[PDB]
Design an enzyme around this catalytic site. Structure first.
Site, PDB file in Angstrom:
ATOM      1  N   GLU A   1       0.842  -1.191   0.000  1.00 14.19           N
ATOM      2  CA  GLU A   1       0.000   0.000   0.000  1.00 14.19           C
ATOM      3  C   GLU A   1       0.880   1.245   0.000  1.00 14.19           C
TER       4      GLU A   1
ATOM      5  N   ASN B   1      -0.394   4.521   0.138  1.00 18.92           N
ATOM      6  CA  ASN B   1      -1.009   5.606   0.898  1.00 18.92           C
ATOM      7  C   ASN B   1      -0.833   5.401   2.399  1.00 18.92           C
TER       8      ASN B   1
ATOM      9  N   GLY C   1      -8.020   1.606   0.605  1.00 18.40           N
ATOM     10  CA  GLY C   1      -8.207   2.093  -0.742  1.00 18.40           C
ATOM     11  C   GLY C   1      -9.185   3.252  -0.825  1.00 18.40           C
TER      12      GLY C   1
ATOM     13  N   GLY D   1       4.682   0.389  -5.059  1.00 16.35           N
ATOM     14  CA  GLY D   1       5.059  -0.890  -5.632  1.00 16.35           C
ATOM     15  C   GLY D   1       5.373  -0.790  -7.113  1.00 16.35           C
TER      16      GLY D   1
ATOM     17  N   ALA E   1     -24.469  13.728 -13.442  1.00 13.80           N
ATOM     18  CA  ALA E   1     -25.533  13.214 -12.571  1.00 13.80           C
ATOM     19  C   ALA E   1     -25.451  11.694 -12.450  1.00 13.80           C
TER      20      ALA E   1
ATOM     21  N   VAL F   1     -20.826  20.949 -20.740  1.00 16.92           N
ATOM     22  CA  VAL F   1     -19.979  21.969 -20.128  1.00 16.92           C
ATOM     23  C   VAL F   1     -18.819  22.266 -21.072  1.00 16.92           C
TER      24      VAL F   1
ATOM     25  N   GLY G   1     -16.706  10.770 -13.847  1.00 21.73           N
ATOM     26  CA  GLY G   1     -16.323   9.380 -13.930  1.00 21.73           C
ATOM     27  C   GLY G   1     -15.051   9.103 -13.168  1.00 21.73           C
TER      28      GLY G   1
ATOM     29  N   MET H   1     -17.465  -0.617 -11.773  1.00 22.61           N
ATOM     30  CA  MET H   1     -16.529  -0.139 -10.753  1.00 22.61           C
ATOM     31  C   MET H   1     -17.260   0.027  -9.426  1.00 22.61           C
TER      32      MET H   1
ATOM     33  N   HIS I   1     -44.500 -10.388   7.590  1.00 20.99           N
ATOM     34  CA  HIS I   1     -45.422  -9.268   7.567  1.00 20.99           C
ATOM     35  C   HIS I   1     -44.779  -8.000   8.132  1.00 20.99           C
TER      36      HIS I   1
HETATM   37  C1  FAD Z   1     -50.421  -6.401  19.802  1.00 20.63           C
HETATM   38  C2  FAD Z   1     -50.215  -7.391  18.686  1.00 20.63           C
HETATM   39  C3  FAD Z   1     -49.139  -7.244  17.817  1.00 20.63           C
HETATM   40  C4  FAD Z   1     -48.929  -8.165  16.787  1.00 20.63           C
HETATM   41  N1  FAD Z   1     -47.851  -7.974  15.932  1.00 20.63           N
HETATM   42  C5  FAD Z   1     -47.684  -8.836  14.952  1.00 20.63           C
HETATM   43  C6  FAD Z   1     -46.568  -8.638  14.047  1.00 20.63           C
HETATM   44  O1  FAD Z   1     -45.785  -7.698  14.105  1.00 20.63           O
HETATM   45  N2  FAD Z   1     -46.438  -9.599  13.064  1.00 20.63           N
HETATM   46  C7  FAD Z   1     -47.281 -10.676  12.889  1.00 20.63           C
HETATM   47  O2  FAD Z   1     -47.044 -11.449  11.967  1.00 20.63           O
HETATM   48  N3  FAD Z   1     -48.335 -10.872  13.742  1.00 20.63           N
HETATM   49  C8  FAD Z   1     -48.512  -9.989  14.734  1.00 20.63           C
HETATM   50  N4  FAD Z   1     -49.550 -10.187  15.621  1.00 20.63           N
HETATM   51  C9  FAD Z   1     -50.470 -11.314  15.388  1.00 20.63           C
HETATM   52  C10 FAD Z   1     -51.478 -11.027  14.260  1.00 20.63           C
HETATM   53  O3  FAD Z   1     -52.321  -9.916  14.583  1.00 20.63           O
HETATM   54  C11 FAD Z   1     -52.382 -12.244  14.014  1.00 20.63           C
HETATM   55  O4  FAD Z   1     -51.543 -13.373  13.806  1.00 20.63           O
HETATM   56  C12 FAD Z   1     -53.286 -12.138  12.782  1.00 20.63           C
HETATM   57  O5  FAD Z   1     -54.104 -10.982  12.944  1.00 20.63           O
HETATM   58  C13 FAD Z   1     -54.170 -13.344  12.552  1.00 20.63           C
HETATM   59  O6  FAD Z   1     -55.033 -13.095  11.428  1.00 20.63           O
HETATM   60  P1  FAD Z   1     -56.404 -13.853  11.296  1.00 20.63           P
HETATM   61  O7  FAD Z   1     -57.078 -13.383   9.964  1.00 20.63           O
HETATM   62  O8  FAD Z   1     -56.187 -15.372  11.354  1.00 20.63           O
HETATM   63  O9  FAD Z   1     -57.243 -13.396  12.554  1.00 20.63           O
HETATM   64  P2  FAD Z   1     -57.702 -11.983  13.105  1.00 20.63           P
HETATM   65  O10 FAD Z   1     -56.678 -10.944  12.808  1.00 20.63           O
HETATM   66  O11 FAD Z   1     -58.001 -12.172  14.578  1.00 20.63           O
HETATM   67  O12 FAD Z   1     -59.009 -11.650  12.374  1.00 20.63           O
HETATM   68  C14 FAD Z   1     -60.240 -12.334  12.682  1.00 20.63           C
HETATM   69  C15 FAD Z   1     -61.395 -11.435  12.332  1.00 20.63           C
HETATM   70  O13 FAD Z   1     -62.612 -12.210  12.300  1.00 20.63           O
HETATM   71  C16 FAD Z   1     -63.629 -11.494  12.990  1.00 20.63           C
HETATM   72  N5  FAD Z   1     -64.636 -12.435  13.449  1.00 20.63           N
HETATM   73  C17 FAD Z   1     -64.458 -13.461  14.328  1.00 20.63           C
HETATM   74  N6  FAD Z   1     -65.508 -14.231  14.462  1.00 20.63           N
HETATM   75  C18 FAD Z   1     -66.452 -13.654  13.630  1.00 20.63           C
HETATM   76  C19 FAD Z   1     -67.790 -13.969  13.337  1.00 20.63           C
HETATM   77  N7  FAD Z   1     -68.447 -15.015  13.831  1.00 20.63           N
HETATM   78  N8  FAD Z   1     -68.424 -13.218  12.434  1.00 20.63           N
HETATM   79  C20 FAD Z   1     -67.782 -12.193  11.888  1.00 20.63           C
HETATM   80  N9  FAD Z   1     -66.542 -11.782  12.115  1.00 20.63           N
HETATM   81  C21 FAD Z   1     -65.916 -12.571  12.979  1.00 20.63           C
HETATM   82  C22 FAD Z   1     -62.897 -10.769  14.096  1.00 20.63           C
HETATM   83  O14 FAD Z   1     -63.642  -9.657  14.565  1.00 20.63           O
HETATM   84  C23 FAD Z   1     -61.637 -10.324  13.353  1.00 20.63           C
HETATM   85  O15 FAD Z   1     -61.849  -9.101  12.666  1.00 20.63           O
HETATM   86  C24 FAD Z   1     -49.788  -9.267  16.662  1.00 20.63           C
HETATM   87  C25 FAD Z   1     -50.865  -9.411  17.525  1.00 20.63           C
HETATM   88  C26 FAD Z   1     -51.079  -8.488  18.541  1.00 20.63           C
HETATM   89  C27 FAD Z   1     -52.234  -8.687  19.477  1.00 20.63           C
HETATM   90  C1  FAD Z   2     -17.007   8.851  -3.400  1.00 20.24           C
HETATM   91  C2  FAD Z   2     -17.113   7.403  -3.807  1.00 20.24           C
HETATM   92  C3  FAD Z   2     -18.176   6.639  -3.345  1.00 20.24           C
HETATM   93  C4  FAD Z   2     -18.308   5.300  -3.717  1.00 20.24           C
HETATM   94  N1  FAD Z   2     -19.397   4.577  -3.228  1.00 20.24           N
HETATM   95  C5  FAD Z   2     -19.501   3.337  -3.564  1.00 20.24           C
HETATM   96  C6  FAD Z   2     -20.618   2.586  -3.032  1.00 20.24           C
HETATM   97  O1  FAD Z   2     -21.486   3.043  -2.289  1.00 20.24           O
HETATM   98  N2  FAD Z   2     -20.657   1.274  -3.432  1.00 20.24           N
HETATM   99  C7  FAD Z   2     -19.747   0.650  -4.277  1.00 20.24           C
HETATM  100  O2  FAD Z   2     -19.926  -0.555  -4.550  1.00 20.24           O
HETATM  101  N3  FAD Z   2     -18.688   1.368  -4.768  1.00 20.24           N
HETATM  102  C8  FAD Z   2     -18.583   2.644  -4.432  1.00 20.24           C
HETATM  103  N4  FAD Z   2     -17.519   3.375  -4.934  1.00 20.24           N
HETATM  104  C9  FAD Z   2     -16.512   2.688  -5.777  1.00 20.24           C
HETATM  105  C10 FAD Z   2     -15.502   1.872  -4.943  1.00 20.24           C
HETATM  106  O3  FAD Z   2     -14.742   2.660  -4.016  1.00 20.24           O
HETATM  107  C11 FAD Z   2     -14.495   1.166  -5.862  1.00 20.24           C
HETATM  108  O4  FAD Z   2     -15.227   0.345  -6.765  1.00 20.24           O
HETATM  109  C12 FAD Z   2     -13.450   0.313  -5.132  1.00 20.24           C
HETATM  110  O5  FAD Z   2     -12.837   1.086  -4.097  1.00 20.24           O
HETATM  111  C13 FAD Z   2     -12.378  -0.270  -6.027  1.00 20.24           C
HETATM  112  O6  FAD Z   2     -11.489  -1.056  -5.212  1.00 20.24           O
HETATM  113  P1  FAD Z   2     -10.071  -1.463  -5.735  1.00 20.24           P
HETATM  114  O7  FAD Z   2      -9.304  -2.251  -4.760  1.00 20.24           O
HETATM  115  O8  FAD Z   2     -10.274  -2.106  -7.111  1.00 20.24           O
HETATM  116  O9  FAD Z   2      -9.352  -0.008  -5.978  1.00 20.24           O
HETATM  117  P2  FAD Z   2      -9.123   1.065  -4.830  1.00 20.24           P
HETATM  118  O10 FAD Z   2     -10.261   1.028  -3.866  1.00 20.24           O
HETATM  119  O11 FAD Z   2      -8.911   2.418  -5.494  1.00 20.24           O
HETATM  120  O12 FAD Z   2      -7.798   0.597  -4.114  1.00 20.24           O
HETATM  121  C14 FAD Z   2      -6.498   0.856  -4.686  1.00 20.24           C
HETATM  122  C15 FAD Z   2      -5.451   0.866  -3.595  1.00 20.24           C
HETATM  123  O13 FAD Z   2      -4.164   0.514  -4.152  1.00 20.24           O
HETATM  124  C16 FAD Z   2      -3.209   1.510  -3.831  1.00 20.24           C
HETATM  125  N5  FAD Z   2      -2.269   1.633  -4.941  1.00 20.24           N
HETATM  126  C17 FAD Z   2      -2.523   2.130  -6.193  1.00 20.24           C
HETATM  127  N6  FAD Z   2      -1.483   2.109  -6.993  1.00 20.24           N
HETATM  128  C18 FAD Z   2      -0.478   1.558  -6.213  1.00 20.24           C
HETATM  129  C19 FAD Z   2       0.878   1.269  -6.474  1.00 20.24           C
HETATM  130  N7  FAD Z   2       1.468   1.496  -7.651  1.00 20.24           N
HETATM  131  N8  FAD Z   2       1.611   0.724  -5.471  1.00 20.24           N
HETATM  132  C20 FAD Z   2       1.023   0.497  -4.294  1.00 20.24           C
HETATM  133  N9  FAD Z   2      -0.244   0.730  -3.938  1.00 20.24           N
HETATM  134  C21 FAD Z   2      -0.944   1.263  -4.945  1.00 20.24           C
HETATM  135  C22 FAD Z   2      -4.003   2.781  -3.548  1.00 20.24           C
HETATM  136  O14 FAD Z   2      -3.282   3.625  -2.657  1.00 20.24           O
HETATM  137  C23 FAD Z   2      -5.251   2.202  -2.879  1.00 20.24           C
HETATM  138  O15 FAD Z   2      -5.033   1.969  -1.494  1.00 20.24           O
HETATM  139  C24 FAD Z   2     -17.352   4.728  -4.575  1.00 20.24           C
HETATM  140  C25 FAD Z   2     -16.293   5.492  -5.045  1.00 20.24           C
HETATM  141  C26 FAD Z   2     -16.170   6.830  -4.676  1.00 20.24           C
HETATM  142  C27 FAD Z   2     -15.019   7.643  -5.202  1.00 20.24           C
END
Ligand code: FAD
Ligand code: FAD
Lengths: 472, 472
Positions: free
Chosen positions: A34, A36, A41, A117, A184, A241, A277, A324, A450
């Protein structure tokens, strides 16, 4: 001072440092180079890490300073931005992550070499230090991970003070009143969104007809653009430009024109961000003496095992072809090192996701509608809006949609494109599906928890497979 | 006024209203009967929706009122809680979701009958209204989705004023100074965590030896308990309640002892929350006259097509066996209705995820270590802490880990258990992996978008498969 190694990695970026660790884990005696001051890099030091930190912090600033928190019963007299404290939190993340790579190198007994290098032979790498000091390493295989660098705009000199690249734009000391972004793309839109939230008036000028870079679905791009405009992000698309000059009073004048020709204008701004570029970095690597020719754009030509023309010299990451992205470079490093040890080497760039960490987020993997039309692929479309997703409504954040592209006859998922909350995490489910060749019906029938945003991803696949979703 | 129908659905909860819409979309003349004023059942009105709304709202309050926003440069002089406004935000979400069910019934031509449904014959359902009027439905198939209700505690009277069930806990007009929760299950831990963040002094009394309900992995439960305790949530495990007395001073005295039996003690609280469980609801449905006997726990026995002993009468959701979860009920409604149209019926309760929406979140799918030891399955463990995840560090929110359980010989994923940020969305990727029977190596080799929490899921699979991860 001579050292001998089995694998020598040049560069400590995502591709370089991950490849180095995996090689040690495979049993190779491994050395990493390296130049630098810190490991990690571009991504860790001036890339992904600092930009995402400011995007997250600026987003929470917007929630407190705006109308969102007041609607939740959280009442605050007045919210102030402390830019220095926000920037230090960014810096604290960069420092913990850059420091982590050195700790990972030490845990796996990976030798760290400080210096610039140069490959001096087929089985030799020489690192030169800042003082002129020298370090020679004798190694069987070499892995080039020298990464990328900023693309300069010919005729604009970036001074990282008021005309800045991504690096300087991440460390501004005060919020500019008006800012212009050249380009851009993914990088420009993220950085512009940060400063727009913190109070700056941001305008983006792009030569192309869309925001988000290449590979983004056009319908997604337009909807993403409309949402950003509603936030205050201004865009001048299909405009070029011609020049930018810093005036004596301190204001930069950017000369713009219609890309097709005409409509001349000059826009003035306090800060100019140039991000049109990035390009591979091979300066002073001495490829000519080894015979490794670069392609027209500066990349190292490599084969499917990531071997260069010389069998024991490899190249991965941003320095070779492909999107790149940090996770793209991280995967080439692993499989390349696995290939060196005799294992198979295969990677599908169609399964590489792209994420834009604005709010709303954008993420996609696979092919867009434009790609499918160009290849003559018969497909069907399933869409589900986040306004019908229970988590989004419960949160009161319902912008965007999920769009699924499926094969017309086999129902196989060809592309997933997400605009809205949680796009980044959601695209990872899409990538796993594409790796397995899963169908839209497969995803529709998997039981999603979900009250997750991923239920929108399930229902969009239901709409593409069955023709209708349940909740829309 | 008699109505003729192909399917008559009793209950409009997640199972009932989803089954009603899917049956209408499949071509059946469908009727749905609801006794309550709104559609949506337990989940939408007094269940998932209002509790998750208060969980995210109290969480944002904790970050603004606490140390989180100040460390990001968001500076506020004084943060005050407006409980009525927060309950207003909860009610607005409940109203939008229940109203959306009515619109979906209108769009799909679902006949909605308001009234108390009773099965009066094999092919007849009679709805009785509040005013005594009757509506008779002659129908080919009946689908029982009458859901669940709170389990009453023997010797404790719930008045929904100071001794409350989950329904009363969702609408408290003031933050209690001290609160005791009977039951440390998923519902109790969420509701206790909401009021703890808003200022309540919260203690949960649980009969079992762990928090989080049945099926949760013990290691995850112990770690989850330790994090909640450090937040201020106190727990008295292996403890039962014998009685509760409203004292003259206005404070409730709760008498407790060891769950197995022991010396009695008294703890005092302003508000007592009773959520020891929920039980299936089938009151006055006419099951006795049909010959449909209930099981010892009150559920309707059904076969693989969800048919009762009477073949054209079906039952789904909380009234039948299996996890009492909304997405479990929704899925049973879909496949049961698809079976009525001749299609296949399949659900794997091992692939149904569970999520707890605290902060940190808890989510899991598949088998726990206890289940695997009980089944005599040889497995291996892969773990990755969120402290080594790049997105978690950038956010400065690094509690918990991802634990993967894989078969020792085939490397096949047997269970995924996540404690930390974004567990809820992450588990859906795990469910798709289990659906395909993926191996740990398969998931590790899929390219995950850099800077997502899902990278921890990928590395945990790499640790289980290869034996080591890259960043830890
Ligand atoms: C606080 C909380 C947070 C949760 N967070 C998540 C989460 O992040 N991710 C996740 O995957 N799950 C989560 N769950 C679980 C999720 O809500 C249930 O797994 C899901 O709602 C089950 O869907 P379902 O259609 O089988 O039943 P339900 O959602 O209970 O729907 C049944 C519906 O049938 C109606 N119904 C029942 N009997 C009758 C009838 N005889 N006539 C007419 N309507 C009727 C009810 O009023 C109700 O509207 C959470 C649950 C709670 C309580
Ligand atoms: C501002 C910016 C943002 C970027 N963002 C992203 C991103 O979000 N995602 C993405 O996938 N890519 C991104 N890139 C591109 C990414 O950085 C490059 O694709 C990647 O770094 C290339 O890696 P490399 O090892 O091939 O070359 P480099 O990363 O340039 O590494 C070369 C290294 O070799 C050394 N070297 C060079 N010549 C010699 C020599 N003769 N002897 C000894 N050492 C030497 C240099 O000092 C350096 O350390 C970005 C680039 C820039 C400029």
């Amino acid at each position: 001072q001579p050292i001998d190694a089995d694998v020598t990695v040049i560069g400590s970026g995502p591709g370089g440092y991950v490849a180095a660790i995996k090689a040690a884990q495979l049993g190779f005696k491994t050395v990493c180079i390296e130049k630098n001051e810190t490991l990690g890099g571009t991504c860790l030091n001036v890339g992904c890490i600092p930009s995402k930190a400011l995007l997250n912090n600026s987003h929470y600033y917007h929630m407190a300073h705006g109308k969102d928190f007041a609607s939740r019963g959280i009442e605050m007299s007045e919210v102030r931005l402390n830019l220095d404290k926000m920037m230090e939190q960014k810096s604290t993340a960069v420092k913990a992550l850059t420091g982590g790579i050195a700790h990972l190198f030490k845990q796996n007994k990976v030798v760290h070499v400080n210096g610039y290098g140069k490959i001096t032979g087929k089985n030799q790498v020489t690192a030169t230090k800042a003082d002129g000091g020298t370090q020679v390493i004798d190694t069987k295989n070499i892995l080039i991970a020298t990464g990328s660098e900023v693309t300069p705009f010919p005729g604009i000199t970036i001074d990282e003070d008021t005309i800045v690249s991504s690096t300087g734009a991440l460390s501004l000391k005060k919020v500019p009143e008006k800012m212009v972004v050249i380009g851009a793309g993914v990088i420009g839109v993220e950085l512009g969104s940060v400063w727009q939230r913190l109070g700056a008036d941001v305008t983006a000028v792009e030569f192309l007809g869309h925001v988000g870079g290449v590979g983004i679905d056009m319908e997604i791009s337009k909807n993403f653009q409309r949402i950003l405009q509603k936030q205050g992000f201004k865009f001048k698309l299909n405009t070029k430009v011609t020049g930018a000059t810093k005036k004596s009073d301190g204001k930069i004048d950017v000369s713009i024109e219609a890309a097709s020709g005409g409509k001349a204008e000059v826009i003035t701004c306090d800060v100019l961000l140039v991000c049109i570029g990035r390009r591979p970095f091979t300066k002073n690597l001495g490829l000519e003496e080894l015979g490794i020719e670069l392609d027209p754009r500066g990349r190292i030509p490599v084969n499917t095992r990531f071997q260069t023309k010389i069998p024991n010299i490899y190249a991965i990451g941003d320095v070779v072809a492909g999107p790149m992205l940090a996770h793209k470079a991280e995967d080439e490093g692993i499989i390349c090192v696995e290939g060196m040890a005799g294992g198979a080497v295969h990677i599908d760039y169609n399964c590489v996701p792209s994420v834009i960490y604005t709010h709303p987020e954008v993420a996609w993997v696979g092919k867009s509608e434009e790609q499918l039309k160009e290849e003559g692929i018969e497909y069907k479309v399933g869409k589900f809006p986040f306004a019908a997703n229970s988590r989004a409504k419960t949160n009161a954040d319902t912008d965007g949609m999920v769009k699924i592209l499926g094969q017309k006859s086999t129902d196989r998922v060809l592309g997933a494109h997400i605009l809205g909350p949680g796009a980044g995490e959601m695209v990872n489910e899409a990538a796993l599906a594409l790796e397995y060749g899963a169908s839209c019906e497969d995803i529709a029938r998997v039981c999603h928890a979900h009250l997750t945003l991923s239920e929108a991803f399930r229902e969009a696949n239901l709409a593409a497979s069955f023709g209708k979703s349940i909740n829309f």
